[PDB]
C-alpha cells in the first residue's frame, strides 16, 4: 500500500528499510569518494527515532529540517567503485535548501524531482557503503 | 493530494497534463530517431477517453493492458536532437511485459522503477516531439 520508488544501485550488501514517516527531522550523510552512510531522524506515531545505514567511513554532513520544510528531490549516481556497484554521489533538495552533492563519483545518474508530494523515507541495500537507495513518497 | 514525479527532459514545447487515472487502458508511442508522441487511453469517473501529446511523426507502437496489468517502471534518455533537449528513448515496464525501448538516441538516462505502487498517469512538455515527461503515482 506504500509508494516506493527505486532502488538505483547494486546487488551487494544487506536490505534496509526505514519505512515511511510523516515527518523527517534530520539527515546525516557520510561520504568520501562515494556514499558510505545515510542516517535519518524521523518522527511518526508519537515517537522520534534515528536509524543509520551503511558503514563507518567518510566525512559527515548534516541538515536539521525546519518546521514546514520537506524533501522535494533526490539526485545521485550509480557507479563502479573498486568493482562494486554502489551510490557514488547523492543530493537531497527541500522546498528551502539544497543538501549536497556529497560523494565524488559519477556514472549512471538517477533523479526523483517530486513536482507534487514529498520524499517521506528511504530504503535500499548497504554494507560498508550504500550499495542501493530508494525513497518512499507521500502526498503533501 | 497527488504524487507527481518529473519532469525529465528539456524546457521546450508546451506543458501538458493528463492528470491521474483510475485505469490506464492503452498507451501508443510514436517514435523514430526520438520520441514524437505519447497517446493514452484512460478511465476515471466512469469515463474513457484518449489524449494525444506530441506531433505527427514516427512509427506507432501500442500496448493494451490486460486485466490486473499496471505500469511499474518508466525509463529513457534525455537527448540532444537537432539542438533541442528532448526525450530520445522511452520504455514502460508492466508487471508482465516490457513495452519498448522506442527511439534511437541516447544521452542522459532517467529511470523511475516503482518497487510498490503504480504509474497512474503522465504529464510533460510537447510540440512536434516529447520535450519532457513525468508520472503520477498511486498505490496498488
Author numbering:
A (entry chain A), B (entry chain B): 3 to 142
Which text from the study accompanies this structure?
A BLAST protein sequence alignment search revealed a candidate lectin from Musa acuminata ssp. malaccensis, which we term Malayasian banana lectin (Malay BanLec). To assess binding of WT versus F84T to HIV, we conducted surface plasmon resonance analysis to determine the binding times to, and binding avidities for, the gp140 trimer, which is made up of uncleaved ectodomains of the gp160 HIV envelope glycoprotein trimer. The results show that F84T and WT Malay BanLec, which like BanLec exist as dimers with two CBS per monomer, bind with high avidity to the gp140 trimer.
We demonstrate that a single amino acid substitution, F84T, akin to the H84T mutation and predicted to remove the pi–pi stacking interaction, does indeed decrease mitogenicity while preserving antiviral activity. The F84T mutation in Malay BanLec disrupts pi–pi stacking without significant changes to the overall structure of the monomer or to the dimer. F84T and WT Malay BanLec have an almost identical structure, with an RMSD of 0.424 Å between all atoms. F84T Malay BanLec similarly loses pi–pi stacking (the “mitogenic wall”), but otherwise retains a structure that is almost identical to its parent lectin. We thus conclude that F84T is less mitogenic than is WT Malay BanLec because it likely does not crosslink surface molecules as well. Taken together, these studies indicate that F84T induces less proliferation of PBLs, less expression of key cytokines/chemokines from PBMCs, and perhaps less activation of CD4 + PBMCs than WT Malay BanLec, indicating that F84T is less mitogenic than WT Malay BanLec. F84T robustly reduced luciferase activity, indicating that it retained the ability to inhibit HIV infection. As H84T is known to have broad-spectrum antiviral activity, we next sought to characterize whether F84T could inhibit additional viruses that are associated with human disease and are known to express mannose-containing N-glycans on their surfaces.
